[PDB]
Amino acid sequence: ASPSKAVIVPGNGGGDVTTHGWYGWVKKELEKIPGFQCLAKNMPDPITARESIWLPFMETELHCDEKTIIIGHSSGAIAAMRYAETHRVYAIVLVSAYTSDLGDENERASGYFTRPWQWEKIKANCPYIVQFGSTDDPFLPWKEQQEVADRLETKLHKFTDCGHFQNTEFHELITVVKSLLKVPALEHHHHH
Ligand SMILES: N[C@@H](Cc1ccccc1)C(=O)O
């Protein structure tokens, strides 16, 4: 499959997707690409981001399919990874990904963390996995970001000063997406 759109799945919280963080700027930049689309919608259950709510929304309302690049931020990165356990997607770009509820009640209530990660299913369903992470992220232990990188064999873009990626512009992400639009050579991953 060749990629036809990106979908931004944001972090949890009530910020309007179009005007909060980098989502709107990235959408606008991607929409400059001739023939390309970028969907970004306010999510149902935006505060707790329940798996049982976000994943059906991603399927039916964001139309996430084998021609989609899913760009997931924080809770949205988590949702992207669970989505890829059961759906083929073109690529996933994970910004501030992690693996556990980090002892947070709102994270636990999401349902994303109540069983192990099906890393092999994700790798099988998604041929291109790119990851952004920052060592100074105030929410995430580096070890959990590293766990995602190791288990999904991601192409890791490791920064020291981006925190939880909450700035308004994100050029490095545009570059990544444009690189994926060329349908780059498949890299060797380990499938079990
Ligand atoms: N998941 C939150 C960030 C967060 C991570 C871990 C614990 C608490 C909060 C977000 O989407 O922004």
Author numbering: 2 to 193
From the primary publication:
RBBP9 possesses a classical α/β hydrolase superfamily fold, and its hydrolase activity promoted tumour cell proliferation during pancreatic neoplasia. Despite multiple efforts to characterize the cellular activity of RBBP9, its enzymatic function in cells has remained enigmatic. Finally, we develop a pipeline to directly identify the branched peptides formed between a substrate fragment and Dap and thereby reveal that the putative serine hydrolase retinoblastoma binding protein 9 (RBBP9) is an aminopeptidase with a preference for removing aromatic amino acids in mammalian cells. Overall, our results demonstrate that RBBP9 is an aminopeptidase with a preference for removing aromatic residues from the N terminus in human cells.
